Write a protein that binds this ligand. Structure first.
Ligand SMILES: CSC[C@H]1O[C@@H](n2cnc3c(N)ncnc32)[C@H](O)[C@@H]1O
Ligand SMILES: CSC[C@H]1O[C@@H](n2cnc3c(N)ncnc32)[C@H](O)[C@@H]1O
Ligand SMILES: CSC[C@H]1O[C@@H](n2cnc3c(N)ncnc32)[C@H](O)[C@@H]1O
Ligand SMILES: CSC[C@H]1O[C@@H](n2cnc3c(N)ncnc32)[C@H](O)[C@@H]1O
Ligand SMILES: CSC[C@H]1O[C@@H](n2cnc3c(N)ncnc32)[C@H](O)[C@@H]1O
Ligand SMILES: CSC[C@H]1O[C@@H](n2cnc3c(N)ncnc32)[C@H](O)[C@@H]1O
Lengths: 263, 263, 263, 263, 263, 263
């Protein structure tokens, strides 16, 4: 209902510990209209290299919004209104495998949705769409993220299955044994779904750069929120280097089409 | 979330007894995406004179949707997606005054909102808008409707205050005495608000052509739904003539000030 | 979805201070299925004279449910499932006129609805109904209540307009001046609407026996909930006498029809 | 709240590609009252052989309603109001196993519910019911469908586990590996639950005739909505023959044990 | 569920144009737990004179929240958790009378609630409370605000009836004529209710200092949001002097009694 | 919003068949305020040994509330307002293994959450909390329950994984094979989650004493509600002895701290 005059081709959704992306030189905060209400915070917009970039911290100012209350539809709609084509999510995840260590990055290629109470789509009728998500993340952006990590010599696992749980509580030992031994998941978090599905419906090329912040229930002391924030803080510098490099590497234009998903 | 390639500059919203406007030569029914879900029915789009017109029966097929359940936001959003600039509403109303006659048309110029359970705006945050509605209807469209009625010699009152109630029940005698003797309203219905509000927020030029179908509680036998449908049916031919003539009379382009409404 | 085996032709809905109607000899409490969930409490069913009567306290056990949270649709649906034809509501009201004194009964004949956001109907589509409520209460039951009061020599005003407010707060002085000097209301409460409209939609013959429990904002000391309960308690005996007598006076069968209200 | 005069003993719920069942000789469309609002479309009622049959397309006209927004409670309630005893569901499913072929029918005998956002029951209190669903489908109807397929020589698998997902997106590869390799499910869809749950609560004898329309993520090119519609269309003729024959084969009367399910 | 260690005895709720109260010398922003979710923004807490004061802008950062979406329950709950006893609201209002001029302050003593879509109470059951609000504002705080304005020689009307409308649209001319001539209202706004209700239920002593920012529909050019912000900006300095002086004038302790409101 | 004068250090939440705990010598029923509305019933408070104990039947009077509609947040909030530190849940569960026999008690040590439609937390923002629940039950309370069962020679399994399903329907055979063979669950119920979550967020020490009432789908006749009630009734006396003994064995004070869970 409002003409959006600001434009950005790349959107960055920051997770825990990344309220300030540390990637902008000059920027401003803007309010973006959505028919779903409030995005998590105002959108920070500014130029990086030759790119206009939009940033939104999914938990908002002061990490005031828990995963189950994030307005995922408003956040993705706001980025679409700005003309965003590429969406880079940076998240904190727990590792379900001894091989994915604290501070390691992971560029997942699959996910399993264990969420419960969310709004999963922009298409509630009369235009019905069933998007394919066999390979849920954008391959070209995943490949560019992997190349950037290799170029910067930042330790990064090139694949992984992300299991998304509802939260806000962390998993019981029985649940985590199920996630690992059975669902064959590698990392765990609470925010990927429905963000990734909505981005696909919005015809964006979305990928996640996850950083392992804890070993879930598997280390001598199980995961606590304090641990997650502390570990993410120790690794913000590397995350910002990776992001800054990846953003300049992206080509102009890259789920690209809804035609075969529309009934 | 999907590109709407169908286009219409004029939108007609049909009320009771007007499921088929009888104004189209060639037409088709389309599904229009909205972030609010389902409009009342598929929209009928077709050309009249040199105008592309979109028609929507607000109660849907078979008059299946009561006033309090109409998805007013989806209906106005759908028309906006089609590029509609002029919205003509045709409605059935009760007369609260005895000098009017059944079958007379009224082009109201004011309203009093007594609704209770509705969603009144497209602006829920973060972009706050407070539209001015001191003169709630579009003056240019009201004037063209009045000129059309004069040209066709169709008895029409050129002003009036519409009191919109919640429904679905009709008013008690005590409420109607208040509406007429204290508020000084002229006509009464259940569907004007929030339709008019939303059209204004969408920067459309909206006007209502109301048809007196009953005398509310004031005749020997009080209003019933059966009476409303019966009287509306006796006057549909005149309504269709008025509607057909008005549509061709409209200029290409005409609440066009969201700028001063935005905080 | 449940076959309701128990039957009652008369339903009593008790308001403030009437958890125990004091009218049954033998009775039992039953759970009644409704598609709207929970009625205010289990329904007490038993015989009085030659009639099967069902009783339900609208605020539930311990007056645990405030007016704005009462499940009016479940309460009326439960009585319909039992075969109830006559519904007698007993309520506590404030007086807006010096002539309607504490302890006086009032059999209202009109109402004005000032409630906000309650659920007003059983007809949300696809079967649309617009019931006529010009004379909102059942005339035959009002007349029998008046005759019973006259026979018992219980002081009772034979007409009156009930203004129903949302609550739970009581009115400001400016609001009460408006209800009286303007809307011409006589008594005030918080529970009549939507109970009366739902009963009409369910084709029952509904009437209210109201008892004045306070003078709203007009006495030197404005109304408090403590006053309402105290005054109601001082007049329970008279209320029970009136109820017991009216119940036996009712003929077998008496809004009687929905035909002309169905679009 | 209104008397339903129309009656049918058999109800058909059509899925994707089955808006027109092609089984009626003479029929009409009716609006059926429900306390849950709108069924997916007006019901089509007509006689076939010696029986009255009711048909409802679960996605509505133009496939306007996605799985997660279908009013399952209104659809089943409407069929119950009509007196339906047998409910035959025709649905499109993906095969999770490669030994099945596109176009094969499957008469499942079990399901696994992975839905997330739905209303699962008609019993929300005060009448609590916990239906048994160990064998979720009606055995007598499944057996009659299997006999019909054998008599018509239509290739049909006589058992199978249906995993019902939330949608509207299709599954990721990691999710589908879990559904097949771990859960051992055979077919997958989005509409079975809570339709089957509700039909059991309504004491109906429900069974699904599923049509394999894709191989989910397992063929060279993963499932798309376009493929589902295309394959369904190629096999509608056979589905109509099976339906027509089954309907005439059913006895007058056959989950009719609500007694032991009521706490 | 959280122990709140921060404390303030005075709370200031700032309205339009008052995001920065300009009264703190040293302060910090805190997050306050509420069972209703998010207050409008973090609460600014700091010392002024010998008082600890808490400030909350009701529209949030960047005036991102419209009146109909403000979480009034969370805002008042947060102030109660901090130990607030006095609540001073500063608001922008339209004048319905030509002698209450632009920039004049008004200390209303009554209100009329015309809101429609809000949550009005903290008491939804099982503890039922009906607060008595005949004189809705705290007399002692009103009297101190009036004394302060007199001492500073700031033009202020010492009484007035505030009519609260739902918004976000402004009133039609017919509604405004009704508010003035019929309801006898003096000023109009959108945010007083339920804020005042809830403060009374929380046993706080609440008063409003209103600033006339427009003449509603009565000047040659009707009210616009642009005008409201402009006039408010022209008078912020005076509002800050009034506020600063009143805050220091308040006694340590003063609706301070729910006992008689409890059923 | 009101001061709770009543105090209890131990809370007992009773499940199916335990409306009357048979543990009190003298007690009374009280209404406890919560910002979430209605707890399942009035809270029974009384003395046992040297302790004040609060009891709440989670299904309410007459087992009127099914698992999916229980107001878990109001029940745990009410116990917190009373000062409860220890919470003992007594529940009915199905056994997924043939060596956990009818009437055997189980003190689970883990759970798997398969619920779908519930409110899982007290922390919806702005104070975000992610409680750790690797070992979801209070170890000290579990150990005391186990010691009590040993002292009374009541057959009890000292560990076990509880899988919580949504209900109200019972599981299909395919789902149950999955819970056992795939998730490695031992017992199954519908009420543990979110009760346990919320108790941990409220910093209470919570444990479940489960009673095997059926073999789910694994016996010759699958579980029915009638069986669950019958088996629970056959073992009520034993459950009451365990409960009475455990209550007196508890020390004054024991999820102890939220500090590390707060972001
Ligand atoms: C700041 S602590 C909470 C955040 O941690 C992320 N997270 C990190 N480790 C885990 C884990 N082991 N399980 C689930 N979410 C996790 C979640 O997405 C949530 O937003
Ligand atoms: C078909 S009967 C119901 C319709 O009648 C219109 N209507 C006609 N007369 C009246 C009246 N007297 N009061 C309220 N609505 C009326 C309403 O807008 C509603 O959609
Ligand atoms: C027990 S105190 C609250 C009850 O008092 C009734 N009531 C009595 N007097 C008044 C009054 N003056 N205004 C509104 N409701 C009133 C209302 O319907 C409410 O259920
Ligand atoms: C018309 S495409 C969408 C429909 O496909 C059905 N469907 C077909 N194949 C699959 C599949 N592989 N996974 C999930 N649903 C499927 C679903 O029930 C949905 O209503
Ligand atoms: C900033 S423009 C919107 C604000 O103006 C206040 N307001 C000012 N003048 C008026 C008026 N004439 N009618 C209603 N609200 C008004 C309202 O409370 C709303 O938050
Ligand atoms: C009185 S029958 C319903 C209750 O049975 C408990 N229950 C007992 N056995 C089972 C089972 N096999 N599966 C699920 N819930 C069960 C549930 O928690 C529900 O509240």
């Amino acid at each position: 209902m409002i003409e959006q005059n600001e434009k950005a081709s790349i959107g960055i959704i920051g997770g825990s510990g990344l309220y300030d992306p540390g990637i902008f030189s000059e920027s401003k905060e803007i309010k973006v209209y959505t028919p779903y209400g409030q995005p998590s915070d105002f959108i920070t917009i500014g130029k990086i290299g030759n790119k206009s970039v939009a940033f939104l911290p999914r938990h908002g100012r002061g990490h005031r919004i828990p995963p189950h209350k994030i307005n995922y539809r408003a956040n993705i709609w706001a980025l679409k209104e700005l003309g965003v084509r590429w969406v880079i999510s940076v998240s904190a995840v727990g590792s379900l495998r001894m091989d994915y260590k604290l501070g390691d990055f992971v560029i997942p290629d699959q996910f399993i949705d264990m969420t419960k109470n969310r709004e999963y789509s922009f298409f509630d009728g009369p235009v019905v769409a069933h998007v394919s998500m066999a390979d849920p993340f954008c391959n070209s952006l995943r490949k560019l993220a992997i190349e950037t990590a290799k170029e910067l010599n930042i330790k990064t696992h090139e694949s992984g299955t992300y299991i998304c749980i509802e939260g806000p509580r962390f998993s019981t030992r029985a649940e985590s044994r199920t996630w690992r031994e059975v669902y064959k998941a590698d990392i765990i978090g609470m925010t990927l779904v429905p963000e990734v599905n909505l981005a696909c419906e919005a015809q964006m090329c979305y990928a996640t750069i996850a950083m392992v912040t804890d070993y879930d229930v598997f280390a001598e002391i199980p995961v606590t929120a304090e641990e997650v924030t502390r570990v993410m803080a120790e690794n913000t510098e590397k995350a910002k280097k990776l992001l800054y490099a990846l953003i300049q590497k992206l080509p102009e234009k890259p789920c690209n089409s809804l035609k075969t998903a529309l009934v």
